[PDB]
Amino acid sequence: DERFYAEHLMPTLQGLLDPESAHRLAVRFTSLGLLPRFQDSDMLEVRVLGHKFRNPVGIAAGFDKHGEAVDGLYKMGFGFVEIGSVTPKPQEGNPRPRVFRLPEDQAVINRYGFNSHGLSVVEHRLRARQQKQAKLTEDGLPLGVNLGKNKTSVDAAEDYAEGVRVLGPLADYLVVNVSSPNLQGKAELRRLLTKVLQERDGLRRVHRPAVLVKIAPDLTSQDKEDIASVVKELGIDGLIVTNTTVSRPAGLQGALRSETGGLSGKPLRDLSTQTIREMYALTQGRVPIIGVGGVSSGQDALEKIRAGASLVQLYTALTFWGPPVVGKVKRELEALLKEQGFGGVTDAIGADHR
Numbered sequence: 260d261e262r263f264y265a266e267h268l269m270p271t272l273q274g275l276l277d278p279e280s281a282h283r284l285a286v287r288f289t290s291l292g293l294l295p296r297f298q299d300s301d302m303l304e305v306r307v308l309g310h311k312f313r314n315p316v317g318i319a320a321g322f323d324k325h326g327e328a329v330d331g332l333y334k335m336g337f338g339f340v341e342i343g344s345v346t347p348k349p350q351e352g353n354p355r356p357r358v359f360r361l362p363e364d365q366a367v368i369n370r371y372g373f374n375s376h377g378l379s380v381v382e383h384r385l386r387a388r389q390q391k392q393a394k395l396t397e398d399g400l401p402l403g404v405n406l407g408k409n410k411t412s413v414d415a416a417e418d419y420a421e422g423v424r425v426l427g428p429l430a431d432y433l434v435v436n437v438s439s440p441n442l443q444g445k446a447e448l449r450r451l452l453t454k455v456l457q458e459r460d461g462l463r464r465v466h467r468p469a470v471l472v473k474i475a476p477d478l479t480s481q482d483k484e485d486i487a488s489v490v491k492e493l494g495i496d497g498l499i500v501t502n503t504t505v506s507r508p509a510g511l512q513g514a515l516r517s518e519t520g521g522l523s524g525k526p527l528r529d530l531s532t533q534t535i536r537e538m539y540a541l542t543q544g545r546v547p548i549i550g551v552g553g554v555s556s557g558q559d560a561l562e563k564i565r566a567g568a569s570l571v572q573l574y575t576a577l578t579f580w581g582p583p584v585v586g587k588v589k590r591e592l593e594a595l596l597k598e599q600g601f602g603g604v605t606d607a608i609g610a611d612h613r
């Protein structure tokens with residue numbers, strides 16, 4: 260069943276379809292609940308900032324950009340779902356092809372360019388299931404919403420504020436995405452996050468989400484220091500670490516390795532894990548981190564948890580392994596936690612800094 264997807268059904272779909280087309284079909288299948296069938300280990304439960312997560316494996320932003328398949332993503336086994344990026348006004352993104360497969364590297368390059376249905380459409384989609392989500396979140400399945408700016412946009416801070424106001428009420432956490440491959444200084448990021456956090460605080464208590472920043476793996480050491488400073492200063496709720504990389508590590512073998520765009524998957528794994536490690540030390544383990552980048556196995560997840568991530572996201576591994584990947588990562592993560600003498604996931608967060 261997991262062997263069937265990895266060895267036969269998934270390679271066949273890839274052989275028959277352009278990646279963006281296959282992305283669209285995946286979303287359709289998931290939206291209709293056409294999914295295969297592991298559940299409910301108490302070791303895997305984690306309570307980040309008080310909110311409780313049933314397992315720590317979520318679907319990264321970008322797969323369900325417009326909130327069309329949220330329920331089917333929970334049905335796949337994910338412990339939380341993140342949708343987006345959503346831009347305020349609708350925009351078409353970049354011309355096609357804009358998604359490229361690097362199978363020799365177990366990697367993807369994409370330059371979607373924030374194709375977004377827009378805040379209004381996503382709002383209605385989320386409003387159509389708002390009370391369903393309330394009960395889901397209560398039973399350990401929270402929802403996150405990832406916000407972008409429009410490309411023709413004038414005030415970037417205004418775009419993120421609109422997102423906070425329109426979609427903040429529907430979200431358990433919000434993500435200010437400032438790390439798309441397709442900002443000036445520390446004082447500029449302080450001005451943006453201060454506006455975002457102010458709009459957030461103006462929402463009613465039961466509609467007041469956590470606010471996380473999502474950062475690139477391509478930051479200089481000074482950028483990471485600056486983010487860490489502003490994050491602790493302004494009381495940002497967390498970090499998502501990392502987005503895709505505009506770097507092109509050596510030894511990438513795919514023919515399409517020189518396409519412009521963000522590289523995801525295995526070649527990002529350890530670069531992503533080292534940024535977690537770095538951001539966790541700079542914030543004294545005081546800020547929750549969702550680790551994302553190249554994760555496709557228990558060991559990939561545990562390395563990021565030991566590095567300081569309280570939760571992990573994946574995306575690219577789903578395009579190779581199919582929906583069975585979620586069960587696989589969960590099953591392995593529980594086995595290695597035991598093996599290594601951890602009581603649960605919470606016992607392991609940051610365990611590498613002792």
Ligand SMILES: Cc1cc2nc3c(=O)[nH]c(=O)nc-3n(C[C@H](O)[C@H](O)[C@H](O)COP(=O)(O)O)c2cc1C
Pocket residue numbers: 319320321322324343344358367369371373405436473501502503523524525527551552553554572573574575576
């Ligand atoms: C095709 C594609 C589209 C993506 N779109 C977004 C996006 O809209 N917003 C965002 O914050 N990240 C986006 N991402 C990045 C993922 O959220 C994730 O950070 C990145 O792919 C690294 O994870 P992975 O190697 O497990 O896929 C996208 C990634 C891919 C591959």
Ligand SMILES: Cc1c(-c2ccc(-c3ccccc3)cc2)nc2cnccc2c1C(=O)O
Pocket residue numbers: 272273276277278279281282284285286288289293294295358360367577578579581582
């Ligand atoms: C194969 C695939 C998938 C994919 C295809 C099918 C399924 C699936 C979902 C539910 C049931 C059975 C299969 C999931 C993901 N997504 C993608 C998403 N974004 C970019 C690229 C891709 C690709 C790709 O061409 O590399």
Ligand SMILES: O=C(O)c1cc(=O)[nH]c(=O)[nH]1
Pocket residue numbers: 321344369370371372373374436438439440441502503521
């Ligand atoms: O083009 C996009 O929509 C996009 C791609 C990506 O890799 N990361 C991101 O934040 N946005």
